[PDB]
Ligand binder design. Structure first.
Ligand SMILES: [Mg+2]
Ligand SMILES: [Mg+2]
Ligand SMILES: [Mg+2]
Ligand SMILES: [Mg+2]
Ligand SMILES: [Mg+2]
Ligand SMILES: [Mg+2]
Ligand SMILES: [Mg+2]
Ligand SMILES: [Mg+2]
Ligand SMILES: [Mg+2]
Ligand SMILES: [Mg+2]
Ligand SMILES: [Mg+2]
Ligand SMILES: [Mg+2]
Ligand SMILES: [Mg+2]
Ligand SMILES: [Mg+2]
Ligand SMILES: [Mg+2]
Ligand SMILES: [Mg+2]
Ligand SMILES: [Mg+2]
Ligand SMILES: [Mg+2]
Ligand SMILES: [Mg+2]
Ligand SMILES: [Mg+2]
Ligand SMILES: [Mg+2]
Ligand SMILES: [Mg+2]
Ligand SMILES: [Mg+2]
Ligand SMILES: [Mg+2]
Ligand SMILES: [Mg+2]
Ligand SMILES: [Mg+2]
Ligand SMILES: [Mg+2]
Ligand SMILES: [Mg+2]
Ligand SMILES: [Mg+2]
Ligand SMILES: [Mg+2]
Ligand SMILES: [Mg+2]
Ligand SMILES: [Mg+2]
Ligand SMILES: [Mg+2]
Ligand SMILES: [Mg+2]
Ligand SMILES: [Mg+2]
Ligand SMILES: [Mg+2]
Ligand SMILES: [Mg+2]
Ligand SMILES: [Mg+2]
Ligand SMILES: [Mg+2]
Ligand SMILES: [Mg+2]
Ligand SMILES: [Mg+2]
Ligand SMILES: [Mg+2]
Ligand SMILES: [Mg+2]
Ligand SMILES: [Mg+2]
Ligand SMILES: [Mg+2]
Ligand SMILES: [Mg+2]
Ligand SMILES: [Mg+2]
Ligand SMILES: [Mg+2]
Ligand SMILES: [Mg+2]
Ligand SMILES: [Mg+2]
Ligand SMILES: [Mg+2]
Ligand SMILES: [Mg+2]
Ligand SMILES: [Mg+2]
Ligand SMILES: [Mg+2]
Ligand SMILES: [Mg+2]
Ligand SMILES: [Mg+2]
Ligand SMILES: [Mg+2]
Ligand SMILES: [Mg+2]
Ligand SMILES: [Mg+2]
Ligand SMILES: [Mg+2]
Ligand SMILES: [Mg+2]
Ligand SMILES: [Mg+2]
Ligand SMILES: [Mg+2]
Ligand SMILES: [Zn+2]
Ligand SMILES: [Zn+2]
Lengths: 24, 48, 91, 112, 76, 252
RNA sequence: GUGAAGCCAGAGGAAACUCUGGUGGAGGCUCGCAGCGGUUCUGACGUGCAAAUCGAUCGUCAAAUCUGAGCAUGGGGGCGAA
RNA sequence: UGGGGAAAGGUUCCAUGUGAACAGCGGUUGGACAUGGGUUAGUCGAUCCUAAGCCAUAGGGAAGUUCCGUUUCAAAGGGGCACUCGUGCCCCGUGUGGCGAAAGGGAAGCCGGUUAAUAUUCCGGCACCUGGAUGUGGGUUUUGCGCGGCAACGCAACUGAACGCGGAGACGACGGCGGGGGCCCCGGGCAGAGUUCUCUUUUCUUCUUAACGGUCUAUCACCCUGGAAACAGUUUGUCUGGAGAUAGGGUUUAAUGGCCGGAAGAGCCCGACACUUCUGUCGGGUCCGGUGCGCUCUCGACGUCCCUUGAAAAUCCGCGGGAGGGAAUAAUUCUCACGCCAGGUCGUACUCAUAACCGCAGCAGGUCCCCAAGGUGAACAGCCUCUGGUUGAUAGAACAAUGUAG
């Protein structure tokens, strides 16, 4: 799969992780 | 047209059982040569 | 039912280019359109693709040969010379 | 027997201006512009078309799920499967020939 | 447009946040009744051959969304 | 007068070479450590035909001794090579058809092809359909080898030059007549702009030295001196002799 | 319109090989529409429709055939089947 | 001499009005004159990529305007992470610019209606693509990254970094043969129309189904059992078979095929009532078969010709490999279903020619393409007709010579 497809998926995971740390 | 008519008839005879494969194969090459003028001439040759 | 007495394959040229010139080209055309037995699979299906390329229609092997023949007398004579020279001298 | 016309500015028949005739629910004869036909992918070694994979233009393959684009085995795409069996057999026998060659050379010629 | 095969999941479709509206069309000549619902992306259609079950279906679906009758010769 | 035809060909505007359909040039591998001391082998993938040439080309795939990849090459194919064949290159390579090994590791009397004038220039001599060169003798001290070229001349090359065993494929291409004006056009239409060609005697005096006249004739000796100004060399240049070749040719 | 290689069947012969009927669809082959070209009437017009056109009659027509846009060669230079 | 376009023209397009001038006669008419009006796009093009080719950079020539040079004797690049905060770290490295196609390569829109003048854009209905954010359902896991089939392979999902291999984009001319859509042709039925001194169960017209999806199927090829000479299968055209045929049973590439949605609510054809107009309302019908060396477009399997073998790049996917990461009460980097947001810039009127372009002009000249009905006939020949389009080229009277054409 092309690189932009992989960058979007890993960027999503990073955003989800920061929100959890901010909440907890 | 004539080649298709003769070849179609021979397939019908073999499946039903009127002739076996050894006579079928010989008649096939006889039809490729200009031997049988029409459908009636071919069935008459089969009877003999 | 032979359709020709002597002209043969080079009958497509009609009455042009002179009798002698048609004979030389016929000598070379006959041998390039024929079929040769494969040296690998053994079937009788090898035909020329390019000016010096021959390939088998069954086993898909491709070999480089002569212009209008699978092999040339000069090239054939060299394999025997090379084989004979190599094996006695080094063995 | 009504005649038709193009619907775009290109007036030439240039292998990218492809049309087919349809009849519309309004009882008229029109022209509908269509794309080109996809080609089935071929095998890596032999060069024949692989079975079980559809034929589309190169861009549409990005919208289809993975299981529809492959076959569940080693070298799922790009290899027919007859060639895959040849690889398995050829690889196994070659290594076995290597074992006997080294034992024969190491033992029978380095015993001194 | 997409078929809904049976009754059970059609009411499931109508119980969605984006089910804007719905309508009923009946064809007297062929003795057929069609139920259509309009969602965000598709327009699901349910086909009923009988007429008795049509009455039960009309009242089972949620009362929030509207139901129409699709008269003849809709005005432009 | 004006500029004659054979003076214009040097400007390179219309008389250039057509190179759209040619993929790569034909060369050996660069001289490297592996091929100077041992040998490496590669697979023959395809036998292809490129326009404007006889002698069908061959594509060979080698590995890389320093990096995780493989390199494809392009050779001139000797008669008898086949797809899937293993061919070897190096100093210790075996002596079979298709191998590439330095000219020193070769007995006298063998025919080779694509011989390097100097070690490392990747092929200069004997690379046309059905041609080859022959080794004659060695000089183990001050290493140098005598060879015989297709024209008959003899040459001495350094002993480290390379060559590929066998005869260039393509055989006797030039035996059957072209027989048709169109066939000649197709042959040249993929090489250069040199067909057809006009006789100089039918031109006008402003165009060519052979010029005009009330009869078509040259008017003066057709053998031109070796040192003449450009625009004068139209004819037999620096001819040693002339006429039908009856006897044998002393030069060798 | 003509009907080259390859293929099928029958007949003759000691053999080498030769006859007859079909099949097939090769060629800078051929008659002939559109296109392209421009032989004759030394026709029409010749202060013309036109600073090269019009009519009848003609040459070639599956190949060295006809053609659009993009790019290159510039004056003692270019290009030229001359 | 019909219906639409490329180059070129630039308001010639539509409405209302008009004395002169122009339309080689007239003129109430006009492509003329005067005053107003008209060209709506995430889906059609440009924009993106490269071809022949052109021009910067490193360097060398020339008194100089400038000439050569395009990877060349160059220290020439880009990727990831974390910090309160930009300014701090860590890998890889052979290579490293732009311009150049409205006919090449290429993500995505179809039907109905509407204006004096535009619409694949505006209105109504039903869809799709790319990019960016996020939640529910279902899936997987305590044997940590799914099951089934001998097999070809199947299904709604079903981890995969560096580096590497392969496929698609991606390609000639001609010849006969077979399948599909459209058109033409023949028979029956329901409506309306023409003809009728006599004949004709007669002659003519209407009877339509889009994009986008679901489901069942269609040549080549491939897999399993088995083992062929009294050789067999088989094309219009002799190719195929112990390197595994015939035969029996299976898997799969390819709808412009059948049925259902969309969709009869639409469009079209008749009949019966309403009336200054703003205005209409309500009834019925919208079927069933046959034929072929027919015409046109498209797809597939074979074959012929070459000292001729018939472009490149952007872009997209699969595989080899195993870096990293992750649950037992939830976690989850699940390419599955549904849902949330956004898509900028310029062109779009009209002619394309015996009057809108070039020939001094409203000139018998010249200028690249798409669609293609009936009869006679070998036929895109010539001659007659239907749909659609014109009836425009200064006119009236007489019929000597000499002319041009027949
Ligand atoms: Mg990658
Ligand atoms: Mg794996
Ligand atoms: Mg050289
Ligand atoms: Mg020339
Ligand atoms: Mg000459
Ligand atoms: Mg002269
Ligand atoms: Mg002179
Ligand atoms: Mg002189
Ligand atoms: Mg003479
Ligand atoms: Mg001819
Ligand atoms: Mg003309
Ligand atoms: Mg005259
Ligand atoms: Mg006069
Ligand atoms: Mg004339
Ligand atoms: Mg006459
Ligand atoms: Mg004539
Ligand atoms: Mg051209
Ligand atoms: Mg000057
Ligand atoms: Mg001069
Ligand atoms: Mg001068
Ligand atoms: Mg010329
Ligand atoms: Mg018009
Ligand atoms: Mg008016
Ligand atoms: Mg006037
Ligand atoms: Mg007047
Ligand atoms: Mg007036
Ligand atoms: Mg007007
Ligand atoms: Mg005006
Ligand atoms: Mg939107
Ligand atoms: Mg587009
Ligand atoms: Mg843009
Ligand atoms: Mg770029
Ligand atoms: Mg420059
Ligand atoms: Mg400088
Ligand atoms: Mg550009
Ligand atoms: Mg294009
Ligand atoms: Mg819209
Ligand atoms: Mg709309
Ligand atoms: Mg999306
Ligand atoms: Mg869950
Ligand atoms: Mg993988
Ligand atoms: Mg192309
Ligand atoms: Mg058809
Ligand atoms: Mg007909
Ligand atoms: Mg009827
Ligand atoms: Mg339908
Ligand atoms: Mg249909
Ligand atoms: Mg079978
Ligand atoms: Mg329906
Ligand atoms: Mg209706
Ligand atoms: Mg009605
Ligand atoms: Mg007819
Ligand atoms: Mg056509
Ligand atoms: Mg328009
Ligand atoms: Mg036109
Ligand atoms: Mg004109
Ligand atoms: Mg006709
Ligand atoms: Mg007829
Ligand atoms: Mg006609
Ligand atoms: Mg008109
Ligand atoms: Mg008069
Ligand atoms: Mg008179
Ligand atoms: Mg007269
Ligand atoms: Zn073979
Ligand atoms: Zn394979």
């Amino acid at each position: 799969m092309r690189a932009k497809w992989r960058k979007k998926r890993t960027r999503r995971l990073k955003r989800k992780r920061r929100k959890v740390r901010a909440r907890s | 047209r004539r080649q298709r008519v003769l070849r179609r008839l021979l397939v019908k005879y073999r499946a039903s059982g009127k002739i076996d494969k050894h006579l079928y194969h010989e008649l096939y090459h006889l039809a490729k040569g200009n031997t049988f003028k029409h459908k009636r001439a071919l069935v008459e040759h089969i009877h003999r | 039912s032979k359709r020709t007495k002597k002209v043969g394959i080079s009958g497509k040229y009609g009455t042009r280019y002179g009798a002698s010139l048609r004979k030389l080209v016929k000598k070379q055309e006959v041998t390039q359109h024929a079929r040769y037995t494969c040296t690998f699979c053994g079937k009788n299906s090898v035909r020329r693709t390019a000016v010096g390329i021959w390939s088998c229609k069954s086993c898909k092997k491709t070999m480089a040969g002569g212009a209008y023949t699978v092999s040339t007398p000069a090239a054939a004579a060299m394999r025997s010379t090379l084989r004979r020279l190599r094996e006695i001298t080094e063995a | 027997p009504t005649r038709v016309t193009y619907r775009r500015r290109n007036p030439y028949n240039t292998t990218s201006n492809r049309t087919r005739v349809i009849k519309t629910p309004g009882g008229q004869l029109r022209v509908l512009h269509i794309k080109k036909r996809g080609t089935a992918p071929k095998c890596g070694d032999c060069g024949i078309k692989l079975p079980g994979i559809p034929a589309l233009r190169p861009r549409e393959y990005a919208t289809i799920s993975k299981p529809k684009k492959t076959v569940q085995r080693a070298y799922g795409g790009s290899r027919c499967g007859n060639c895959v069996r040849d690889r398995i057999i050829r690889a196994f026998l070659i290594e076995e020939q290597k074992i006997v060659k080294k034992v024969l050379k190491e033992q029978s010629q380095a015993e001194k | 447009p997409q078929e809904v095969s049976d009754i059970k999941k059609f009411i499931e479709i109508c119980r969605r946040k984006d089910a804007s509206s719905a309508r009923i069309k009946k064809n007297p000549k062929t003795q057929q009744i069609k139920f259509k619902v309009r969602c965000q992306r598709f327009l699901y259609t349910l086909v009923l051959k009988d007429s008795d079950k049509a009455e039960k279906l009309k009242q089972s679906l949620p009362p929030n969304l509207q139901i129409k009758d699709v008269p003849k010769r809709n005005k432009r | 007068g004006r500029v004659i035809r054979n003076q214009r060909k040097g400007r390179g505007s219309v008389f250039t070479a057509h190179t759209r359909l040619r993929k790569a040039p034909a060369k050996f591998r660069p001289l490297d450590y592996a091929e100077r001391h041992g040998y490496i082998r590669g697979i023959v993938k395809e036998i292809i035909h490129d326009p404007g040439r006889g002698a069908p080309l061959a594509r060979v795939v080698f590995r890389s001794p320093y990096k995780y990849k493989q390199i494809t090459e392009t050779f001139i194919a000797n008669e008898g090579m086949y797809t899937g064949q293993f061919i070897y290159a190096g100093k210790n390579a075996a002596l079979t058809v298709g191998n590439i090994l330095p000219l020193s590791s070769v007995p006298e009397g063998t025919v080779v092809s694509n011989v390097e004038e100097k070690p490392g220039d990747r092929g200069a001599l004997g690379r046309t359909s059905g041609n080859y060169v022959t080794v004659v003798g060695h000089n183990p001290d001050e290493g140098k080898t005598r060879i015989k070229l297709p024209s008959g001349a003899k040459k001495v090359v350094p002993s480290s030059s390379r060559g590929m065993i066998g005869i260039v494929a393509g055989g006797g291409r030039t035996d059957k007549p072209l027989l048709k004006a169109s066939r000649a056009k197709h042959k040249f239409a993929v090489k250069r702009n040199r067909w057809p060609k006009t006789r100089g005697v039918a031109m006008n005096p402003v165009d060519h030295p052979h010029g005009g006249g009330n009869h078509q004739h040259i008017g003066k000796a057709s053998t031109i001196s070796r040192y003449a100004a450009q625009g004068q060399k139209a004819g037999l240049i620096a001819a040693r002799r002339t006429g039908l070749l009856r006897g044998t040719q002393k030069t060798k």
